[PDB]
Amino acid sequence: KDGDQCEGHPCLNQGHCKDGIGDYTCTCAEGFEGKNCEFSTR
């Protein structure tokens, strides 16, 4: 276990989360955005 940076469910609204050497990145599902994939555009 080295670095999944996805510990502690960080993204919101079923936002997926990849990995990186400095903070992961959030991927909002179609219809969400915001710093956390928080916001439902609709």
Binding flags for ligand OH, 12-41, as an x/- string (CB under 6 A) = ------xxx---------------------
- Closest separation between CB of residue 34 and ligand OH, Å? 21
- Closest separation between CB of residue 11 and ligand OH, Å? 14
# of chain residues touching ligand OH (CB under 6 A): 3
d(CA 42, CA 33): 10
Instruction: Give the other-Cβ count within 10 Å of 10's Cβ.
Output: 14
**By C-alpha distance, which of 38, 2, 8 is closest to 26?**
38
Footprint on this chain of ligand OH (rule: CB under 6 A): 18-20
